[PDB]
Amino acid sequence: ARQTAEQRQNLQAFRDYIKKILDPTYILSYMSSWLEDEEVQYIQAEKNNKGPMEAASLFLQYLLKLQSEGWFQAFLDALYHAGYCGLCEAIESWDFQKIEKLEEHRLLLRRLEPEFKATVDPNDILSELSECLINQECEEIRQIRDTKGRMAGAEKMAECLIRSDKENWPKVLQLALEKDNSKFSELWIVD
Amino acid sequence: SSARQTAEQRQNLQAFRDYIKKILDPTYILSYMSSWLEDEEVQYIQAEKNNKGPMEAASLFLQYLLKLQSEGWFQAFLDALYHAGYCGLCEAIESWDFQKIEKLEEHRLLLRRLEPEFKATVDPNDILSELSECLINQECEEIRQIRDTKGRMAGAEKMAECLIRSDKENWPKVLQLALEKDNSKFSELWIV
Amino acid sequence: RQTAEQRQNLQAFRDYIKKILDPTYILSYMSSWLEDEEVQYIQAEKNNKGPMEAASLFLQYLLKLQSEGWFQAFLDALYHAGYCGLCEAIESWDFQKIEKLEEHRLLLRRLEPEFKATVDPNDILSELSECLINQECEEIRQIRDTKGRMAGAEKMAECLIRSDKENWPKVLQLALEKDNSKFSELWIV
Amino acid sequence: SARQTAEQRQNLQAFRDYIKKILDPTYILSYMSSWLEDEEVQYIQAEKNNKGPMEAASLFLQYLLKLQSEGWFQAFLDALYHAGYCGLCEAIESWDFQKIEKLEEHRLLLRRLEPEFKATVDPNDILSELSECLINQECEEIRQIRDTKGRMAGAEKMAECLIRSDKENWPKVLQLALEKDNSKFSELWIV
Ligand SMILES: [Cl-]
Ligand SMILES: [Cl-]
Ligand SMILES: [Cl-]
């Protein structure tokens, strides 16, 4: 049970990468047997009241105090089956290089988000990008597009890509933008 | 509501505290809370629901309820539960018999564990109408709002969480029947 | 004086009101009595939780007002929005006509699946318009025209269940019979 | 310089009530996401969804008044302008809200007439004539509501956006559009 101590120290070290990717509300269905119903609802309420990142921070607070045998592997499995293969792979090997290399394109898309909202319609490329987002994120993007309009939906799409753990989502996005012939492709340089 | 009757009413509430806090959202009996509780205590209970969730709000509501002394607080509580829709929970408290609510535990755990498969194969728009009498009236309304603002998986998860907290003795069977009408991949996983 | 008495009756009957009233339909009449934040909080509650939770929040605010004439503004707003039945009940504090509808609220709740399968709102919406708020009829038509018959049929069923019109069950029977629909055989009043 | 920061904070605090009646911060967050913490950005978005624009703007100002990085104020002005808040930008930049105060009379009149507006105006008829007075994303949300919930729902959303418009002449543009459509509401809206 020194492995656990080493596992706890590393999570705190990499909490800034984790909270930038993980929306814990998406992996609570795979971890419900490890958390109290009250803890599940507190994490869910924190997401609705403050956002994904603070919800992830609270989820880690609970995660770092668990003691049952195998709590860490349960987290890895929950991440994987929810769709966080990239984040799961990074945590399992404590190597965030593939996620660090994405920082440049996280900064670029966030800086260019106004042009993104002005020139991209999520209804045109969401299917091509469904391998870079959690299935529920794609569902929320379509509902927002259907209730609030194109610009509102495009912003949700941009925010979801920024938190994607797929090492090549910038290239996936470039290909989708070119297939639809979008003014934004001229602003998106991958290779 | 003498001294020997409050003690029995208090003893009964604590005896079933885990059954109550797993079913009751005190936000739904707010007209009872405001006429029997201090206004400040009501707002703390409301803050607890918004900030922590229904279960923590129910736990806090019970703390206040167990300290009341006013005449008729217990029977008023039962009356509130019934008119809110908590017929099963109200019927259980009056007769100290939670057998019908205990038989549901088997299906509460099953749906909780199978929640990923539920969200993946079920659309509340297909079964919400069939399941209305198993949920509180406000729960049906929030399920549709979530379904329309966040999508199918989000609405399905809220529905599953509301079924888990249902006190209707036969909601597992009603759910199975609705699932069969649509011929859904989840029916093979839901045995009653 | 009468404010204090009117305040006490609202709390007594709040649960009947929030079963009928969607405050989103009377906020255009009441914005001068509520802070802008309170108006928008009620609107967000409607979008996030539904009419009933929005009505509960509106009543909490309404029960703390003190300005002169807030109650009379509420009655008039109910009328101009279309809540004639609910307005008539509040003026006399007699909810017998709305209580008597509970039997048919439960029946239409039971039969909503059969309703969605056999009823087209485009056929009876006009006959039932005086049982619904005008804005509800518009949303039923938008749903019917964008999402299909069942979606509009479900929206209609949910709106009738919340109707304060004392004779909407009989109006529904007659309209369904006028069109000769398979659901009329299950709807007898 | 700290002097300019200090003076800019006092003036923002001085006008916080004019700002929070016009500014929906969700519309200028894409231009300022680089100046706020990810947590602060998402909390502002949750506040909009949970409480509305005014509470979101009030929360946004609390964060704005604690910034210290070089150029945060000019970034705020740039975000406002390019989002479409030219009038509010002109008012904040020059500390003159005369044009926005002069609108108070017509904000009150339209709000009072909101029932008559919803009953006689269809956004499909005047939205194009009025798009100059509204944020581009507001026009998209008006059409989505108009197309999913109907005319009265869209008409009320339209009035709410006009009420928060920072264009000094939106009352006159509305009158002209209502006359072009020959609308029952024109008899109630002059000047
Ligand atoms: Cl209430
Ligand atoms: Cl536009
Ligand atoms: Cl002009």
Asked if C59 contacts C14 with a C-beta cutoff of 8 angstroms, the reply is yes
CATH topology of domain D101-191: Death Domain, Fas (1.10.533)
- Chain D residue with minimal CA distance to A56? D39
Q: Measuring CA to CA, which residue among D75, D77, D61 is closest to residue D19? A: D61
Domain with CATH 1.10.533.10 in chain B: 1-101, 102-192
Other Cβ atoms within 10 Å of B3 Cβ, number: 7
Q: Which CATH number fits domain B102-192: 3.90.1010.20, 1.10.533.10, 3.30.9.10, 1.10.40.30?
A: 1.10.533.10
In the reported structure, the alpha carbon of residue D189 is separated from the centroid of ligand 3 by a whole-number distance in angstroms of 14
Instruction: Say how many Å lie between the CA of residue D132 and the centre of ligand 3.
Output: 10
Measured between CA atoms, the residue of chain D closest to residue A113 is D30
Q: For residues B77 and B61, give the distance between their C-alpha atoms in angstroms, rounded to a whole number.
A: 12
Q: What CATH number belongs to C99-189?
A: 1.10.533.10
The 3-class SS string of D58-117 reads: HHHHHHHCCCCCCCHHHHHHHHHHHHCCHHHHHHHHHCCCHHHHCCHHHHHHHHHCHHHH
Instruction: Tell me the C-alpha distance between B53 and B26, whole Å.
Output: 11
Q: Does A74 touch chain B (CB under 8 A)?
A: no
**Alpha-carbon span B96 to C173, nearest angstrom:** 43
CA distances, C165 to each of A103, C108, C151, C172 (Å): 60, 15, 23, 11
B-chain residues near A37 (CB < 8 A): 22, 55
Q: Are D133 and D173 in contact (CB under 8 A)?
A: yes
Nearest bound ligand to the CA of residue D167: 3
Decide if D154 touches C, using CB distance below 8 A. Answer: no
Q: Which chains touch C (3 or more CB pairs under 8 A)?
A: B, D
Residue A55 class from Cβ within 10 Å (0-12 exposed, 13-18 middle, 19+ buried)?
Answer: buried
Q: Using a CB cutoff of 5 Å, list residues around ligand 2, an ion.
A: D 136, 139
| 3-state secondary structure labels for all residues of B65-117 | HCCCCCCCHHHHHHHHHHHHCCHHHHHHHHHCCCHHHHCCHHHHHHHHHCHHH
CATH of domain A100-191: 1.10.533.10
Rg (CA), chain D: 17
What 8-state DSSP symbol labels residue D177?
H
Distance D25 CA to ligand 2 centre (A): 18
Say how far apart CA A84 and CA A99 lie, in whole Å. 12
CATH superfamily to which D1-100 belongs? Death Domain, Fas (1.10.533.10)
How far, in Å, CA of A146 to CA of D141, rounded? 10
User: Which string of DSSP letters, residue by residue, matches A146-160?
Assistant: HHH-HHHHHHHHHHH
Chain D residue closest in CA terms to A151: D137
How many CA atoms within 13 Å lie on the side-chain side of B60? 23
Task: Please choose, from the candidates A11, A169, A160, the residue with its C-alpha nearest in 3D space to the C-alpha of residue A96.
Answer: A11
Q: CB–CB of B32/B80 below 8 Å?
A: yes
Handedness of CA B174, B176, B181, B186 (dihedral sign): positive
Outline which parts of chain A fall under CATH 1.10.533.10. 1-99, 100-191
Cβ-contact A119, A150 below 8 angstroms: no
Distance (angstroms) between ligand 1 centre and the Cα of B36 equals 14
Question: Is B145 in Cβ contact with C48 (below 8 Å)?
Answer: yes
State CA D64 to chain mean position distance: 18
Show the tokens assigned to A40.
């599940």
- Taking Cα atoms as reference points, which of B145, A145, C47, C140 lies closest to residue D140? A145
Kindly report the CATH number that applies to the domain delimited by C1-98: 1.10.533.10
CATH (residue range B1-101): 1.10.533.10
The number of C-alpha atoms within 13 Å of C43 and in the hemisphere containing its C-beta is: 24
Q: Where exactly does CATH 1.10.533.10 map onto chain C? A: 1-98, 99-189
Question: Which of D149, A74, A119 lies closest to C43, judged by CA?
Answer: D149
- Among D26, D30, D35, the strongest candidate for a mutation testing the A interface, having the largest count of A CBs within 10 A, is D30
Q: Give, as one character, the DSSP assignment of residue C26.
A: S
Contacts of C112 in chain B (CB under 8 A): 129, 132
The sign one gets for the Cα dihedral D157, D159, D162, D163 is negative
Which residues, including other chains, have CB under 8 Å from residue A81's CB and lie 6 or more apart?
A30, B116
Residues of B in contact with C116 (CB under 8 A): 129
CA separation (Å) from D105 to B187, D28, D102, D178? 61, 27, 7, 19
Q: Do D43 and A52 touch (CB under 8 A)?
A: no
C14 to B31: CB separation less than 8 angstroms, yes or no: yes
Distance D22 CA to ligand 3 centre (A): 20
Resolution in Å equals: 2.5
Residue A27 DSSP one-character state = S
C-alpha–C-alpha distance, residues D63 and D58, integer Å: 9
Cα distances (Å, whole numbers) of residue C85 to A98, C20, C41, C65: 64, 10, 27, 24
Q: Boundaries of CATH 1.10.533.10 in chain D?
A: 1-100, 101-191
By the 8 A CB rule, do C87 and C79 touch? yes
| Residue A25 CB contacts under 8 Å (≥ 6 apart), including other chains | A43, A44, A47, A52, A55
Per-residue CA distances from B178 to A163, B171, C105 (Å):
37, 10, 21
The CATH classification number of A1-99 equals 1.10.533.10
Q: Do D39 and A50 touch (CB under 8 A)?
A: yes
Q: How far is CA B138 from the centre of its chain?
A: 11
- Gap positions in chain A, given as the residue before each gap (C–N > 2.5 A)? none
Query: What DSSP state is assigned to residue C31?
Result: T
Ligand 1 center from residue C57 Cα (angstroms): 7
